[PDB]
Amino acid sequence: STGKVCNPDNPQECLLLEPGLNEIMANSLDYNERLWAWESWRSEVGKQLRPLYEEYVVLKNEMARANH
Amino acid sequence: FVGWSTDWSPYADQSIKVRISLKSALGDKAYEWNDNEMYLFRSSVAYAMRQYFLKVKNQMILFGEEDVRVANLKPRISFNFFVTAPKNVSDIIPRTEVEKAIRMSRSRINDAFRLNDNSLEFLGIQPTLGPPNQPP
Amino acid sequence: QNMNNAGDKWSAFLKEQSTLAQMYPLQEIQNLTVKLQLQALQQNGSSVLSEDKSKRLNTILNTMSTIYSTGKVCNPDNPQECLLLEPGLNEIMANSLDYNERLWAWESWRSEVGKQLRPLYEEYVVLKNEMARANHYEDYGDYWRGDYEVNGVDGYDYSRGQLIEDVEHTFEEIKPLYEHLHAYVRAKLMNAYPSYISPIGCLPAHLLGDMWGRFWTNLYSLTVPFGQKPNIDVTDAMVDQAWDAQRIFKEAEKFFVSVGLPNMTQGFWENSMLTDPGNVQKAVCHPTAWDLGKGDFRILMCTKVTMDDFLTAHHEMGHIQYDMAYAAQPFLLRNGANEGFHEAVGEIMSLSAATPKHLKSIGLLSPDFQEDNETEINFLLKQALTIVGTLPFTYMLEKWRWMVFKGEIPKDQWMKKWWEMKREIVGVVEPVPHDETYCDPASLFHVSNDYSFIRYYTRTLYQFQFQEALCQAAKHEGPLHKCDISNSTEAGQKLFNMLRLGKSEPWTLALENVVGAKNMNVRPLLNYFEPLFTWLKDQNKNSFVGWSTDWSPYADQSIKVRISLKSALGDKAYEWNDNEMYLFRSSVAYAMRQYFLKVKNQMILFGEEDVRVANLKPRISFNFFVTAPKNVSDIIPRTEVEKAIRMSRSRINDAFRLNDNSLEFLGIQPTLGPPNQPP
Amino acid sequence: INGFDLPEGNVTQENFVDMQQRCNASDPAAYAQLVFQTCDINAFLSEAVEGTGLAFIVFTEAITKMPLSPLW
Ligand SMILES: *[C@@H]1O[C@H](CO)[C@@H](O[C@@H]2O[C@H](CO)[C@@H](O)[C@H](O)[C@H]2NC(C)=O)[C@H](O)[C@H]1NC(C)=O
Ligand SMILES: *[C@@H]1O[C@H](CO)[C@@H](O[C@@H]2O[C@H](CO)[C@@H](O)[C@H](O)[C@H]2NC(C)=O)[C@H](O)[C@H]1NC(C)=O
Ligand SMILES: *[C@@H]1O[C@H](CO)[C@@H](O[C@@H]2O[C@H](CO)[C@@H](O)[C@H](O)[C@H]2NC(C)=O)[C@H](O)[C@H]1NC(C)=O
Ligand SMILES: *[C@@H]1O[C@H](CO)[C@@H](O[C@@H]2O[C@H](CO)[C@@H](O)[C@H](O)[C@H]2NC(C)=O)[C@H](O)[C@H]1NC(C)=O
Ligand SMILES: *[C@@H]1O[C@H](CO)[C@@H](O[C@@H]2O[C@H](CO)[C@@H](O)[C@H](O)[C@H]2NC(C)=O)[C@H](O)[C@H]1NC(C)=O
Ligand SMILES: *[C@@H]1O[C@H](CO)[C@@H](O[C@@H]2O[C@H](CO)[C@@H](O)[C@H](O)[C@H]2NC(C)=O)[C@H](O)[C@H]1NC(C)=O
Ligand SMILES: *[C@@H]1O[C@H](CO)[C@@H](O)[C@H](O)[C@H]1NC(C)=O
Ligand SMILES: *[C@@H]1O[C@H](CO)[C@@H](O)[C@H](O)[C@H]1NC(C)=O
Ligand SMILES: *[C@@H]1O[C@H](CO)[C@@H](O)[C@H](O)[C@H]1NC(C)=O
Ligand SMILES: [Zn+2]
């Protein structure tokens, strides 16, 4: 909810997902701008979530086996 | 046509295939190909791209190892790679210019890995030059 | 835009009347008053450039101003918390006592912002040099030095090149006092950051109390001479007598009447913002004095009941008394004599109102109170952290900008000359090395917002010249720092004969109406801090006074490299450009990744940006050290980098076609190999 | 070269003595730790070896620096 992505040419304008990065993916017809928003969202957020999720899966499998 | 083929890719026509034969160039005295050797390979390609744009086009473009995108890694030791602009993922450098940059620095990439031009092949870049005019 | 439609109405009236002023050349005017107004009106400014060069320059100036105010820096561990400079990153550099947190905020501010400003500023300098040459100046620094120029007033002249010689002349006399303050602060900082500061070297740049080391005033809680004695503060006696924000402006009004200056203006007493409203009525609280015209003088400040808001009232009312004195002058000649006189008159009022001799007669500071000679040392060292600690910084920065504008520093040597002048003049060393991708001077406000900086040097020298001359007319007996000019009408007459001039006369003549000389002088500043200079020389008996420009915070974990290309190859030898240094930083980062995987079984993602290179030479030599991947405070120790290089030395040699004698590491020698040939 | 940071092919035999004084006029107290040699021919040609050393410690040292050492 708080991770944001900013522009290569202007690093002072950073967009959150829920306003601004969704309106690019819903309204733009520019191939290059849609590819920037798709890939740069997966980068940072992507990686953080990576280790987080790994730990998550591990812990979640222990709760379910103790409930048979 | 109804249906899809799982082989086409948006980056597949600007990729170059690499094939590495470690146990034929060395045999024994041969190292193991981990992820640290792929980092050195992405740095030698980024070195070779910086030199070509400086001596042919007189531009200074700061290519990094993160601009060399590697796909389809196998045990035989093969992968595809393409090169993008330093912070513009939409700008793929064309394949005919990456072929000229690799030709300029092929002897320098071979020495960094102890391979010699037949155990490090690029599949579409073949070595050309060299007259054997020995006797005077 | 109720004021922008009035402001653009005024900005356009000037350029209409400026072209009409071109009809009267200056070689025929004999009257000096009508000549001085025409010089202010005939100057072209940026109206002399091309039509698309004048809009390229205004775009760079708006871009550099926006990167400064909106650029932010976030945390390595949590990338979602980003801090701006003006809140949050200044409070780290002013309050933290953690070496690692201060080093993060210092370095990460210079990175991003640094680089952007780099190219911006390059373009900037280029464009700025074209505007000044079309206005018949040498460069843009000569344009800035034209505020101090006097031409042909028969014995009061002053060149634009004479300001460079008078600044360097007065600076060589402040240098003994600054070295004893430098050596005292260094010894006290060694008790706060042990094993980080050398007892004979420079001071690390991130430990100085703010982001740039412009003032050393936040170092007072670490460097106080007698910590158990408190300073004189009357912020609690003002509440016991219930002083509101109208009595403290009536006390400032009585201070100026006592020296002979007039009262306020009824209109003034009527209009003013002497207190904060508090409700949804908004407004700016910065303390400002206003000179709206036709006898309208107003002051706007959110006035609390504190000791320094009592002092700021004396400072701002000195600006009003200066504006009230040249109100009989023409409109173009209504300012100070130069840019430094206006803020120097305001600071000798708050200097004389803060003395305990003054406060015990105003109603505060109970009448049986004898001040100790240990609180006078506490008072003087707090003054020297702000006054004396800023003078080598101010001199070095304008000297760097004056030489960049005239071309004596080439564009590939901007950052190399910046840190050589900081180690030599200021005694301050960088904690990490910086190449020509940085623009560390442009990370200050005044550099990226296009302001001259020599006015803060000359104002400091005029301030003690005015105070020493006004305390001789008031017949002061003891030291200069206890002086009070109140109840002396003959001292308020020497001040008023300079106050009433404005820019009607040269500034060399307005000095002689007060101090009895024509040039700026540094001996009254040295007489002010004379009881502190005696005490500092006794505290520095066993210490070393001075600094060596060779010690560095990263110098004991560096490794020297030496490369001999034409001996290993001879011919068939390549040229060592910056692309070969990138491959060298990648081979060291490769060698660090392999050592931590096969000896310690950790996966640490070293990059080429973690290999920090310093001291590059033609022979082909440099020093390098390796840091953690995104932690600049974590330097990998040298004995572990020596083991990583030994493991992969044959692999680094093959990448460059060198063989172990043309690529040496100076402390890593090859060992192994028995020559047991025959069976 | 290891003390004054000069290029490689810098300061050959033709320019030894003039580049000795360019360094000490550039910066003193860095020439005082430099150890130079006073080696010159007619001192390397003038050893008095005789009787067995002209074949076992003089002639066989010059053979090792030739092209085909184990044939000469
Ligand atoms: C990133 O690279 C792409 C090229 O793939 C750039 O796109 C070009 O943009 C210009 C104007 O913006 C167009 O006239 C070109 O037609 C575009 N190229 C293509 C192939 O469509 C894009 O501008 C680059 N982005 C940045 C920030 O430099
Ligand atoms: C320079 O010119 C100004 C006019 O612009 C002169 O000022 C006038 O001086 C006379 C007598 O000194 C006064 O009666 C006028 O009122 C002044 N004019 C204004 C507008 O105030 C000034 O005297 C001239 N200077 C010299 C040295 O002749
Ligand atoms: C200010 O700029 C102008 C450029 O417009 C300079 O040139 C004068 O321009 C006027 C037209 O407004 C002409 O009538 C003059 O002949 C021009 N002078 C010259 C020497 O070409 C003007 O000289 C500049 N003024 C100053 C004081 O620098
Ligand atoms: C300036 O001088 C006046 C008078 O010489 C001082 O006013 C006297 O203050 C003392 C104590 O502060 C009182 O006992 C007297 O009654 C006051 N005299 C009058 C006539 O009111 C004033 O304090 C002096 N100001 C300073 C700053 O020294
Ligand atoms: C403040 O003044 C006092 C008294 O003049 C000084 O104290 C004396 O200093 C001398 C010098 O070493 C000693 O010999 C005496 O024994 C001290 N007197 C006492 C009672 O201890 C003091 O040094 C002064 N402090 C400053 C900072 O100047
Ligand atoms: C960056 O590296 C420094 C080491 O230089 C780390 O500082 C250590 O922090 C721990 C707890 O935070 C202390 O117990 C150690 O004493 C510190 N080391 C030193 C030498 O003082 C710092 O934590 C690292 N930062 C990150 C984000 O990992
Ligand atoms: C200043 O104003 C006060 C009234 O507030 C008046 O008594 C005093 O005489 C005035 N000062 C002078 C110099 O007239
Ligand atoms: C040695 O260095 C000097 C200094 O620039 C240079 O002028 C000279 O050409 C160099 N000598 C050689 C042989 O390169
Ligand atoms: C530099 O050293 C040499 C060697 O002793 C000496 O002859 C020469 O005078 C020195 N240079 C100067 C300027 O003293
Ligand atoms: Zn002010």
Report DSSP state, residue C504: S
Cα C636 off chain centre by: 33
Same domain, C514 and C389: yes
State whether C93 and C165 are in the same domain. Answer: yes
Residue entry with tokens 């300079």 = C498
For residue C338, which of C156, C164, C147, C510 has the smallest C-alpha distance? C147
Whether C92 is in the pocket of ligand 3, judged by its Cβ within 6 Å, is: no
CB C274 within 8 A of CB C285: no
- C446 included as an active-site residue: yes
Q: Has residue B4 been placed in a domain?
A: no
* Residue C441 and residue C213 in contact, taking contact as beta carbons nearer than 8 Å: no
> Which of C573, C551, C577, C554 lies closest to C564 in space, CA to CA?
C573
For residue C678, being part of any structural domain is answered with no
Residues 280-319 of chain C whose Cβ lies under 8 A from any Cβ of chain A? none
Q: Please answer whether residues C97 and C114 qualify as being in contact, where contact means their C-beta atoms are separated by less than 8 angstroms.
A: no
Q: Do B115 and B27 contact (CB within 8 A), yes or no?
A: no
Tokens of C409: 């520093």
Quickly tell me which residue has 């002249």 as its tokens: C157
Contacting chains of C (3 CB pairs or more, <8 Å) are A, B, D
Touch D-A: 3+ C-beta pairs under 8 A: no
Q: Search chain B and give the residue with CA nearest A8.
A: B87
Q: Does residue C676 form part of some domain?
A: no
Selection from C615, C612, C213 nearest residue C425 by Cα:
C213
Decide if C621 and D1 are in contact by the 8 Å CB cutoff.
no
* Partners of residue C158 on adjacent β-strands: C150
Cβ pair C187, C543 in contact under 8 A: yes
C–D interface: beta-carbon pairs under 8 A: 21
Measured at the CA of D60, the angle between CA D54 and CA D61, to 5 degrees, comes to 100
Nearest to B104 by CA among B127, B81, B86: B127
Rounded Cα distance between C75 and C80, Å, is: 8
Nearest one of C246, C279, C276 to C264, comparing CA atoms: C246
**Claim to verify: residue C311 and residue C423 sit in the same structural domain:** yes
Residues C649, C503 within the same domain: no
Number of structural domains found in chain C: 2
- Judged by a CB distance cut-off of 8 A, whether residue B88 touches chain A is yes
Report the alpha-carbon distance of residue C239 to residue C252 in Å, rounded.
Answer: 18
Going by their DSSP bridges, the two strands B16-20 and B68-71 should be labelled as unpaired
CA distance to C248, C253, C355, C560, C603, per residue, from C239 (Å): 12, 20, 20, 64, 63
Q: Which residues of C are part of a known binding site for chloride? A: 110, 418, 422
- Please report which ligand is nearest the Cα atom of C492: 7
Q: Are residues C249 and C164 in the same domain?
A: yes
Cβ pair C620:D2 closer than 8 A: no
CB nearest to C70's CB, from A2, A12, A48: A12
> Does residue C293 belong to any structural domain of this protein?
yes
Tokens of C382: 């707090």
Q: Does some domain include residue C305?
A: yes
Residue where a domain stops, chosen among C551, C570, C590: C551
The catalytically annotated residue of C107, C253, C316, C468 is: C316
Question: Are C621 and C483 in a shared domain?
Answer: no
**C123 is annotated as an active-site residue:** no
Q: Please state whether C565 falls in left (phi above 0), alpha (psi between -120 and 50) or beta.
A: alpha
State the distance from the centre of ligand 4 to the C-alpha of C322, rounded, in angstroms.
26
User: In angstroms, what is the span from residue A32 Cα to ligand 1's centroid?
Assistant: 7
Is the distance from CB of B45 to CB of C606 less than 8 angstroms?
A: no
Q: Which residue has the tokens 């740049």?
A: C205
**Residue-wise DSSP of B28-91:** SS-----HHHHHHHHHHHHHHHHHHHHHTS-------GGGEEEE---TTSEEEEEEEETTEEEE
The closest alpha carbon to C657, from D53, B124, B111, belongs to B111
Q: Is residue C290 within a helix (H) or strand (E), and if so which, with residue range? A: strand C288-291
B77 inside domain: yes
**Residue at token pair 């500061």:** C197
**A65 known ligand binder:** no
- The CA-based angle D38-D39-D40, given to 5 degrees, is 120
With beta carbons under 8 A apart, name residues in chain D contacting C617: 5
Q: Please tell me the experimental approach by which this structure was elucidated.
A: cryo-EM
> Cβ(C389)–Cβ(C181) under 8 Å?
yes
B88 and A39 in contact by Cβ < 8 A? no
CB atoms A35 and B87 under 8 Å: no
Statement to judge: residues C559 and C533 lie in one domain: no
Q: Does C521 share its domain with C582?
A: no
Boundary of a domain, candidates C509, C524, C551: C551
H/E stretch holding C312 = helix C307-323
CB D48 within 8 A of CB D41: no
Cα separation, A38 vs A24, whole angstroms: 10
Joined tokens for residue C454:
């020599």
B78 domain residue, yes or no: yes
Closest partner residue to C579 (CB to CB) among B34, B51, B65 is B51
Percentages helix, strand, coil for chain B (3-state, rounded to 5) are 35, 20, 50
Chain A residues with CB under 8 Å of B88 CB are 8
Chain mean position to CA C623: 30
Range of the domain at C557: 552-671
- The gap from C-alpha C69 to its chain's centroid, in whole angstroms, comes to 18
- C579 & C542 share domain: no
* Residue B48 belongs to some domain of the structure: yes
Q: What is each CA distance from C380 to A7, C185, C385, C479, C532, in whole angstroms? A: 51, 14, 9, 12, 6
- Written as six digits, the tokens of C279 are 């409700």
- Structure tokens belonging to residue C569: 């190859």
Q: Does the distance separating the beta carbons of A12 and C66 come in below 8 Å?
A: yes
Q: Are residues C431 and C565 in the same domain?
A: no
Beta-carbon contacts of C549 under 8 Å, excluding residues fewer than 6 positions away, are C202, C420, C423, C424
C139 lies in the same domain as C179: yes
Q: DSSP letters along C225-278, please?
A: SSTTSPPP--TTHHHHTT--TTHHHHHHHHHHHHTT-----HHHHHS-B-S---
Residue with tokens 């079309």: C134
Residue B32 CA to residue C381 CA, distance in Å, equals 65
Element (H, E) at C632: strand C631-635
- Could you identify the residue written with the tokens 């305390």? C471
Of C489, C519, C551, the residue at which a domain comes to its end is: C551
Cβ pair D56, D62 in contact under 8 A: no
User: Distance between CA C129 and CA C148 in Å, rounded?
Assistant: 20
B79, B90 Cβ separation under 8 angstroms: no
Cα separation of C319 and C268, whole Å?
13
